[PDB]
Amino acid sequence: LGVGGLDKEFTKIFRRAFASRIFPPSVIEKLGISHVKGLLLYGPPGTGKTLIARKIGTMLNAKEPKIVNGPEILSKYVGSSEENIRNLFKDAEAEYRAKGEESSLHIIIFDELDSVFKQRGSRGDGTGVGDNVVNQLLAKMDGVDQLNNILVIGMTNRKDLIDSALLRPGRFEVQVEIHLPDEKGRLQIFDIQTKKMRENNMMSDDVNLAELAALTKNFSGAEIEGLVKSASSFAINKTVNNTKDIAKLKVTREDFLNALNDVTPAFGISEEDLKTCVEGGMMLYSERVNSILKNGARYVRQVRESDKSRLVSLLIHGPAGSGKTALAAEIALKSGFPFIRLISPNELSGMSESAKIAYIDNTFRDAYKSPLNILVIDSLETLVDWVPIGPRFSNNILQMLKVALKRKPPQDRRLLIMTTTSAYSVLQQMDILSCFDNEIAVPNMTNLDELNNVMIESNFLDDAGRVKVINELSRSCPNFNVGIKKTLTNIETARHDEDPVNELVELMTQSA
Amino acid sequence: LGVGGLDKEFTKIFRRAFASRIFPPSVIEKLGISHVKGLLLYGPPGTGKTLIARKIGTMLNAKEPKIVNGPEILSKYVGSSEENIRNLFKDAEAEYRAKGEESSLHIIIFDELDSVFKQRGSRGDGTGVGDNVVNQLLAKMDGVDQLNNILVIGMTNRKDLIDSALLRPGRFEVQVEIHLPDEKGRLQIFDIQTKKMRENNMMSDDVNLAELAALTKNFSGAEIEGLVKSASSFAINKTVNNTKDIAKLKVTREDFLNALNDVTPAFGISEEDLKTCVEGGMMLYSERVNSILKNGARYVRQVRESDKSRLVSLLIHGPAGSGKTALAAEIALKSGFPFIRLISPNELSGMSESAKIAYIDNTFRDAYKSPLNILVIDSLETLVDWVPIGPRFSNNILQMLKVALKRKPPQDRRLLIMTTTSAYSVLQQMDILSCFDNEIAVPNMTNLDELNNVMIESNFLDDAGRVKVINELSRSCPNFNVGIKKTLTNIETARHDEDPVNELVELMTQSA
Ligand SMILES: Nc1ncnc2c1ncn2[C@@H]1O[C@H](COP(=O)(O)OP(=O)(O)OP(=O)(O)O)[C@@H](O)[C@H]1O
Ligand SMILES: Nc1ncnc2c1ncn2[C@@H]1O[C@H](COP(=O)(O)OP(=O)(O)OP(=O)(O)O)[C@@H](O)[C@H]1O
Ligand SMILES: Nc1ncnc2c1ncn2[C@@H]1O[C@H](COP(=O)(O)OP(=O)(O)O)[C@@H](O)[C@H]1O
Ligand SMILES: Nc1ncnc2c1ncn2[C@@H]1O[C@H](COP(=O)(O)OP(=O)(O)O)[C@@H](O)[C@H]1O
């Protein structure tokens, strides 16, 4: 005991990796079988793998597990690395000659395994550093030097990089996956972490753990440890400057609520980028805008409450300066989904091409590990480096994006994608219009009534003047055609001049 | 005894490689012949090669075979690699001086042979690691230092890489192939594996091995051994938590049936990818769909009960959104074949060009080792990276695929191939249309009756409302042209709205 939220996995591991070790050697001999010598656990970081490995050892009363780290061995000098691997198994070798089939169990943990394979074959074999450890390790548990006391546990974050040679029977025969916890699991983790405080009357009676289990929506276990530590920090600092009356120390609900603002999770919301940069006003100057927002809300609920629709892709298009991005963000912030991210040119500035591919792929990879997700892609045509003189563009990134937009996430998960563009004709010429499930159009302003609404909404000036602007434009140029960004960047400059009324009309004539 | 399914090969090996060692030396000298010093076995892994190697030795009462692993020798430092070969034969050299012609037989096993040749000539010769072992090895069995007590066995999974110089007489004269077992072979392997349970009264009376032999369709030996071990795991875990009344332990049929869900074989069915990703509905909305499914069933039965047709290939083509892939998958799952795989852009994402070529070639190789096989190739034009601005595309992959679609499998095996494409004219220009034997076209929806059927079958809403949609469309736009995918996306997006009828009408008019 000491682990929460992983009952089913625990039963599965114990049935296969350890159950046969409990029985006396006689019956195992009489059945005619041989023990399992490899187990592979995979999943995201900070989720509780090493803890399971450690706690299973305590029931069997084996020795304390030895631990080894991948880059440690790989980074040492060649000769030392070659000599190192033989030093790990010495104790297990000795006890076998001592006691044979009655020997006690020895458990070895191997961490960041994939790092050994993550290199080109030429460098791995010519240098030999990558291949040497793998070969010696397989020799010690499969070949003629077979040693019958050991059990090896390997831990990885990316299963697809492990070579298939290692997965066949006789080597790493059992594989298990660990998931981010759900609400009930987090309730248990909170209990395990606050037990010691609760049992010494150092925790206040206003704390309700069921509510915290609902606020911490997409957290892992390590994050919960951090949250408790920060809460305790509040209570400790309130008394220092070391004083009398330490015996009345107690943590309180306010401490936790303030703690939430200091620990931010991975797999969370990129709040600042969406809120500040992309949204500096929202005003309902026409019926079309309200229509667009209602359609967006439709799609959000559609994704949230159906099992047929687990991938929806949309394209928002229109002229430059119309409003696209701000709309996308506005749809995202009202959703309430736990996971939201955006890919934009700002993030990829200053990189080489290969780096760009790696970044995009890791982002999509991370989107596949939570129950609900949203992704925003900004200005597709710029990510591909389009210039029309050549024309010139990067084909590899285009193919990466083309494949990513159609793939479906695994195991009853679901995501939504929004993308924004200003060069619809180019996308038509590159024939990737078959990826998007629906299209939305954003038009400019073309009636003077809309202008009046915008002026009313931004507190331009009293009615008497706003009438004059419309009257002058009525026969200056009644057929104008301008976006919203420009209109709201001409009102700003007009306000700080000496003749507001005569300045805005001229700027509007010029833009049209 | 201890091996099953390989009687013919046992006879043929014993007749050539060993029969001469039994006779007294007088008669062998008296005929004037010489013993054979090389034997090569090739076949897929986990099929029983080292087993036969060990078992043949115990009849002759030779010394326990020494074993050496290729990459082990190649990965060591250069000096020790050159020195170590000479240590392998030391004992054999000793006994020859000791006793002369009357010595006993010495048997040396060499594993993963092809690895030594799998390198460029420049690196192999300049470094010398690859060439040195080969040269020193041939010296000991062919040259003036010929040693007359040894026998060398080579073991490899790919014969095409071994150089033709080694196979000539005096070196590795005899070559043999190992196959995956057929039904009777599996029936024998089960007996060999379950003997010790049966002889100690630890196996129930309901287990019938003839049924298990028929369920496990493309298993090799190692998978059958793992299957027995997993069933034992079930029987053991049911008591723990180590108790009284261990003596009544017994395995049972339920355990085997449950064990089938835990061991998944190579050369099996990739169920999840075909089932989940590709099929999220199937509804018979017209006569053309019935016709297509019936044609597919026809071809399957053709491939299964004829000797003249050992290779068939089909092309399914039509507009984007028509239904293609889901059809292919539907035809595949109903077939009941043992082996099914598919190649799609998802598996090849993020690879270099050389890696892609290697992956495709390995897949086609793995297809040629079972009686019946199905392959599905999805979105051909995306595999080649087509973009029409240049145009730009990869020529090497195209030539690889063009060769692969005509090659016929060896030795009375047979396969069926299906491929899907949306760019028929592009392939017309590439001139690869001569590879396919038949062509199927999938059309779009063009009648209101079909739409009625689709609405009825998806439970859209009660009849009273269902009639009104058809009424309104009958005079809004009677000549519409839309695929199935977009229809089933508009339906769902109209169920979660406040006025389903108007919303559906507007969307469907826009798509048409
Ligand atoms: N109703 C509205 N719709 C859209 N944007 C609005 C609205 N009201 C105010 N705005 C503001 O107007 C600005 C619109 O500029 P935005 O960056 O979204 O343009 P864009 O279409 O993405 O153009 P670009 O081609 O330059 O990327 C934002 O600051 C947004 O907050
Ligand atoms: N009778 C049917 N025929 C084909 N597809 C059907 C049928 N009934 C339902 N569907 C559904 O139609 C959906 C769309 O089909 P599918 O994904 O195979 O299209 P596609 O031709 O591969 O398109 P793309 O151009 O995107 O590659 C599938 O999810 C399938 O489940
Ligand atoms: N399921 C869990 N229950 C309780 N504590 C957990 C859990 N998962 C992680 N932890 C906390 O995480 C810390 C160690 O996690 P760690 O060993 O880093 O996992 P990983 O295998 O991801 O490295 C411990 O201090 C432990 O309290
Ligand atoms: N044809 C067979 N008959 C009996 N046992 C087999 C057979 N094939 C494989 N096995 C099982 O496989 C194990 C050894 O296979 P292995 O020596 O790894 O063959 P190879 O490595 O040459 O493919 C043994 O435990 C044996 O019980």
Author numbering:
A (entry chain G), B (entry chain A): 239 to 479, 488 to 758
Task: Recite the paper's sentences.
SNARE (soluble N-ethylmaleimide-sensitive factor (NSF) attachment protein receptor) proteins drive membrane fusion at different cell compartments as their core domains zipper into a parallel four-helix bundle. After fusion, these bundles are disassembled by the AAA+ (ATPase associated with diverse cellular activities) protein Sec18/NSF and its adaptor Sec17/α-SNAP to make them available for subsequent rounds of membrane fusion. The disassembly requires multiple ATP hydrolysis events in the presence of Mg2+; as few as six ATP hydrolysis events are sufficient. The side-loading and side-release mechanism explains how Sec18/NSF can disassemble SNAREs with constrained topologies.
Next, we asked whether this same side opening of Sec18 occurs in the hydrolyzing condition without SNARE substrate. We prepared purified wild-type Sec18 in the presence of ATP and Mg2+ in a three-stage procedure that yielded a pure sample used for cryo-EM studies. Two bands were visible in native gels, indicating two oligomeric states. Processing and classification led to three classes, two of which appeared to be heptameric and identical (280,935 particles and 73,253 particles, respectively) and a third class that contained indeterminate density in the D1 ring (70,513 particles). Density for the N domains was not well resolved in any of the classes, presumably because of the conformational flexibility of the N domains without substrate or adaptor present. The heptameric class is nearly identical to class 4 observed in the y20S complex under hydrolyzing conditions. Each protomer in the heptamer is similar to the others, with an average r.m.s.d. < 1 Å between them and the angle between the D1 and D2 rings varying only within a small range of 61.9°–67.1°, in contrast to the hexamer, with a range of 60.8°–92.3°. The D1 pore diameter is 30 Å, larger than that of substrate-bound hexamer, with a diameter of ~11 Å. The substrate-free structures (hexamer and heptamer) are nearly identical (r.m.s.d. = 0.48 Å) to the substrate-released structures.
